[PDB]
Amino acid sequence: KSFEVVFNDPEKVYGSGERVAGRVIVEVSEVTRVKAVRILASGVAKVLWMQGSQQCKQTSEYLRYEDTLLLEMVIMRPGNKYEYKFGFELPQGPLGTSFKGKYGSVDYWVKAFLDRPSQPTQETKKNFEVVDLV
Length: 134
Ligand SMILES: [Ca+2]
Prior knowledge:
Blueprint (H helix, E strand, L loop, with lengths): L1 E6 L11 E9 L4 E3 L1 E11 L1 E4 L2 E4 L2 E9 L5 E3 L5 E8 L15 E12 L2 E9 L7
Antiparallel strand pairs: 1-2, 2-9, 3-8, 4-7, 4-10, 5-6, 10-11
The structure holds calcium ion.
The site of calcium ion has 3 residues, from strand 7.
Family: Belongs to the arrestin family.
Subunit structure: Homodimer; disulfide-linked. Interacts with TXN/thioredoxin through its redox-active site. Interacts with transcriptional repressors ZBTB16, ZBTB32 and HDAC1. Interacts with DDIT4.
Subcellular location: Cytoplasm; Nucleus
């Protein structure tokens, strides 16, 4: 019914070593037996190019955090905000912006997972920027 990520600062951009924290906010219309809510956070640097007829792709993992949040099976009900809290630290040193500069893309985000027994996990995704503290 409603499944957002929301960071403590809605307008913040983060640098190296800083801690991204926020909430996961859920709303059900019907009554729901949720298995669990989770989170994957990723800092990936892609760069893609041609090479004759080849397409090459070269990746870099700067960030990769997985958490199961809390508030071990839950009865969600309508008219409440089931809020789940999460937080981690981006690495020290480079965070991607300037992988090999310009043409090298950085890609930061938080995904929220919702699991229910018999039910295909739902997702929701929110981007966030980082600045190189470099
Ligand atoms: Ca946990």
